[model samples]
Target: TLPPIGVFWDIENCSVPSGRSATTVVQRIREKFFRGHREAEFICVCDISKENKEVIQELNNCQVTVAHINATAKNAADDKLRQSMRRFANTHTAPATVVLVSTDVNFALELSDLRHRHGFHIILVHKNQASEALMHHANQLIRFEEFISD
Candidate 1:
């Protein structure tokens, strides 16, 4: 069966190079997991600190859910993003994949639980700050650097 995949993007906690467009990274993500599954869910989560109309519009254009969090506390988006992913995991059926794009080690235990306890497929993405624990726990890991092109 074609796996039902959902992407949880934690944009505020991650970073791309200066010259490269972040939207292009999203496109690359789409190009990878979005194939063969027309109804795949794509969601991008970020804090209010990184507000940009263009970013929101681009995400909307690509049919992605914007889970924007409005908060001043540190690591505000982490909980919101994790909750959204967990919500989907609990509600969705089996043979599903949760593609989390974040480097937060706080999710390591949850990711492992989701994979082992609940039998959910985990595909993790990260750029430079990927946690070793996360990398070890995830069923699959994709380096963000590979997605960027010159």
Candidate 2:
């Protein structure tokens, strides 16, 4: 059996250009990593706006939780996501496979900490938006291009 996984998506960070949906990437991660597995939770963090409700609802349909963060503050969404990650690790009974979807290399250290100190398997999901530094640091890396239907 695969280790139980929990996914956290950084919406603003993984912004799609156009005629594309980041949610598709998220869905692919779901199918690839935790498909047919209830031992997974999808949490998407964003500076929510009215225009994005449809997308949010779509994610909800996929059993994803849309976490709203203060748009006015810089990196608020990122901070909230980190908090949620830590929270889940501590509170969730099982040692879940932690998956982070973003291009931010700043998370490399945090991922390292979680992996080394806290003992969590960290997977980084990005769309060519990450650097070699971060990718090499991750326990596993999933590039979005492979999954994106171009």
Q: Give the candidate number with the greatest TM-score.
A: 1
C-alpha RMSD for every candidate: 2.2, 2.7
Backbone clashes per model, in order?
0, 0
Estimate the lDDT of model 1.
Answer: 0.75
Candidate 2 vs. true structure, TM-score:
0.81
- C-alpha RMSD between model 1 and the true structure: 2.2
lDDT against the true structure, per candidate, is 0.75, 0.72
Model 1 backbone overlap count: 0
Query: Clashing residue pairs in candidate 2, if any?
Result: none
Question: Evaluated with lDDT, which candidate comes out highest?
Answer: 1
